[PDB]
Design an enzyme around this catalytic site. Structure first.
Site, PDB file in Angstrom:
ATOM      1  N   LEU A 227       1.137  -1.016   0.233  1.00  0.00           N
ATOM      2  CA  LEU A 227      -0.004   0.202   0.035  1.00  0.00           C
ATOM      3  C   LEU A 227       0.567   1.325  -0.322  1.00  0.00           C
ATOM      4  O   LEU A 227       0.692   2.094  -0.488  1.00  0.00           O
ATOM      5  CB  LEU A 227      -0.959   0.121   1.297  1.00  0.00           C
ATOM      6  CG  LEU A 227      -1.735   1.249   0.892  1.00  0.00           C
ATOM      7  CD1 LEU A 227      -2.711   1.037   0.712  1.00  0.00           C
ATOM      8  CD2 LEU A 227      -2.388   1.374   2.786  1.00  0.00           C
ATOM      9  N   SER A 228       1.464   0.892   1.095  1.00  0.00           N
ATOM     10  CA  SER A 228       3.000   2.908   1.073  1.00  0.00           C
ATOM     11  C   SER A 228       3.526   2.827  -0.679  1.00  0.00           C
ATOM     12  O   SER A 228       3.740   3.881  -0.384  1.00  0.00           O
ATOM     13  CB  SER A 228       3.828   1.966   1.883  1.00  0.00           C
ATOM     14  OG  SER A 228       5.311   0.753   1.476  1.00  0.00           O
ATOM     15  N   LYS A 229       3.633   2.074  -1.062  1.00  0.00           N
ATOM     16  CA  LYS A 229       4.019   2.201  -2.233  1.00  0.00           C
ATOM     17  C   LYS A 229       3.228   2.957  -3.247  1.00  0.00           C
ATOM     18  O   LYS A 229       2.418   2.655  -4.846  1.00  0.00           O
ATOM     19  CB  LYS A 229       4.473   0.988  -3.568  1.00  0.00           C
ATOM     20  CG  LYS A 229       6.017   0.477  -3.184  1.00  0.00           C
ATOM     21  CD  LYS A 229       6.362  -1.150  -3.013  1.00  0.00           C
ATOM     22  CE  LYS A 229       5.607  -1.585  -4.674  1.00  0.00           C
ATOM     23  NZ  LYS A 229       6.379  -0.634  -6.142  1.00  0.00           N
ATOM     24  N   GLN A 230       3.018   4.329  -2.772  1.00  0.00           N
ATOM     25  CA  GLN A 230       1.946   5.414  -3.817  1.00  0.00           C
ATOM     26  C   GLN A 230       0.248   5.144  -3.983  1.00  0.00           C
ATOM     27  O   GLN A 230      -0.113   5.726  -3.478  1.00  0.00           O
ATOM     28  CB  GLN A 230       2.847   5.687  -5.429  1.00  0.00           C
ATOM     29  CG  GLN A 230       4.056   6.283  -5.314  1.00  0.00           C
ATOM     30  CD  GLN A 230       4.834   6.100  -6.779  1.00  0.00           C
ATOM     31  OE1 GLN A 230       4.496   5.184  -7.372  1.00  0.00           O
ATOM     32  NE2 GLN A 230       5.404   6.946  -6.957  1.00  0.00           N
TER      33      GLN A 230
END
Ligand SMILES: N[C@@H](CCC(=O)O)C(=O)O
Ligand SMILES: [Zn+2]
Length: 290
Positions: A227-230
């Site tokens: 999720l953290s990946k943009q």
């Protein structure tokens, strides 16, 4: 013997989103379950990337979701003298040096510093400050995940403490401030696992007590990707269904019929029912948060 002290330390580069709510809630529940203090620190150490009003939004959001901190909020923008003081000590102790190498140079040799300036005695002029590592930490204990093995090359780097552009590095500020605030356990997002060993190396070089660590579940989108990946802001409205989703993410009991409970009641029950061992190593968020 001394009281547990934990903290939530957001960067005001945006308002709270589901991932940062997970960090705030996880650190809060563990702190309260351990009958300890839970502090909030605003990590406003990088003015350019900060958003005016975001820090205040975050504090308002925490209260809205029922998460009340102990004492006063610490602001890193009011700690520059403390970071300077710690850097002066490292330099006097022979534990740091000034580096005049360009980013182009570092990229050309593979992206990891080679210790070029280690014994060149450059002055501070247009220089970055690097730590002079002695015995780099390459593994650490996570109280939830067990022993973690870090990337060795990154772990052993004489990493930056004060950037050429004048900004204090996160790795420096987090150690100085957690120590200053008496933090005994750091409960934080999965994205912060890798720098942990560098921070521990730094505690050791200062001669300070190393705290305990817990890294919360890696958040995945519904498709199974990081999720953290943009990332959507937390709803301004009824926080209850969001808190219930966050408890589920953390592997905790979660009242499906939250309509008959207040936010405070849901949290009180979550503290009573907190089981650290039930927190998973990864979790999939629902579409509302992706
Ligand atoms: N402000 C940093 C620090 C996190 C921490 O060490 O808890 C972040 O949110 O990524
Ligand atoms: Zn250099």
């Amino acid at each position: 013997d001394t009281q547990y002290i934990g903290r939530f330390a957001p960067s005001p580069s945006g308002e709270l989103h589901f991932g940062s709510l997970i960090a705030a809630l996880g650190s809060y529940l563990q702190a309260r379950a351990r009958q300890g203090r839970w502090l909030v620190r605003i990590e406003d150490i990088d003015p350019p990337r900060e958003v005016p009003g975001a820090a205040e939004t975050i504090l308002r959001q925490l209260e809205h979701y029922g998460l009340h901190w102990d004492g006063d909020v610490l602001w890193q923008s009011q700690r520059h003298d403390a970071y300077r003081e710690a850097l002066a000590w490292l330099h006097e102790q022979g534990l740091s040096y000034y580096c005049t190498c360009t980013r182009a140079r570092i990229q050309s040799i593979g992206g990891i510093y080679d210790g070029h300036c280690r014994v060149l005695h450059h002055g501070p002029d247009n220089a970055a400050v690097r730590i002079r590592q002695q015995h780099p930490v390459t593994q650490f204990t996570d109280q939830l995940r067990g022993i973690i093995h870090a990337d060795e090359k990154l772990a052993r780097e004489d990493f930056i403490i004060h950037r050429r552009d004048g900004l204090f590095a996160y790795n420096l500020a987090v150690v100085v401030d957690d120590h200053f605030q008496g933090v005994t356990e750091i409960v934080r997002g999965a994205d912060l696992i890798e720098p942990t060993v560098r921070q521990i190396s730094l505690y050791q070089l200062f001669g300070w007590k190393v705290p305990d660590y817990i890294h919360l579940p890696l958040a995945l989108n519904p498709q199974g990707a990081k999720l953290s990946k943009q990332a959507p802001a937390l709803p301004k409205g009824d926080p209850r269904p969001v808190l219930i989703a966050a408890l589920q993410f953390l592997g905790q009991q979660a009242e499906a019929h939250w309509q008959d409970f207040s936010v405070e009641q849901i949290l009180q029950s979550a503290v009573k029912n907190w089981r650290l061992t039930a927190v998973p190593e990864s979790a999939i968020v629902n579409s509302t948060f992706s």
